[PDB]
Design a protein around this ligand. Structure first.
Ligand SMILES: *[C@@H]1O[C@H](CO)[C@@H](O[C@@H]2O[C@H](CO)[C@@H](O)[C@H](O)[C@@H]2O)[C@H](O)[C@H]1NC(C)=O
Ligand SMILES: *[C@@H]1O[C@H](CO)[C@@H](O[C@@H]2O[C@H](CO)[C@@H](O)[C@H](O)[C@@H]2O)[C@H](O)[C@H]1NC(C)=O
Lengths: 32, 32
């Protein structure tokens, strides 16, 4: 599935998770 | 409860599920 803000819950600062990867998540709110 | 896009998740093509029923779902984003 396309990784949207409904599929995922966000909590962190992108410096503590070992193995995190760079990608763009999608939001259904900005478009509307 | 009123069938909204958060109560349900969408995945399919309306042609493979046996017993599907025509109805309208609701989304809280189009109004806003
Ligand atoms: C994911 O993307 C980040 C920015 O969108 C990257 O941060 C950068 O990190 C470099 C050094 O790695 C800095 O020079 C730069 O200023 C910025 O902070 C991040 O590195 C990147 N990580 C991966 C794994 O792609
Ligand atoms: C649910 O609603 C669909 C359209 O909103 C219906 O599709 C139609 O199917 C007929 C043939 O039955 C076509 O002639 C028409 O062009 C349209 O594609 C669908 O049938 C309907 N299903 C039920 C169970 O009511």
């Amino acid at each position: 599935q396309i990784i949207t803000t409904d599929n995922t819950f966000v909590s962190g600062n992108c410096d503590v998770v070992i193995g995190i990867v760079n990608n763009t998540v999608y939001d259904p709110l900005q478009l509307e």
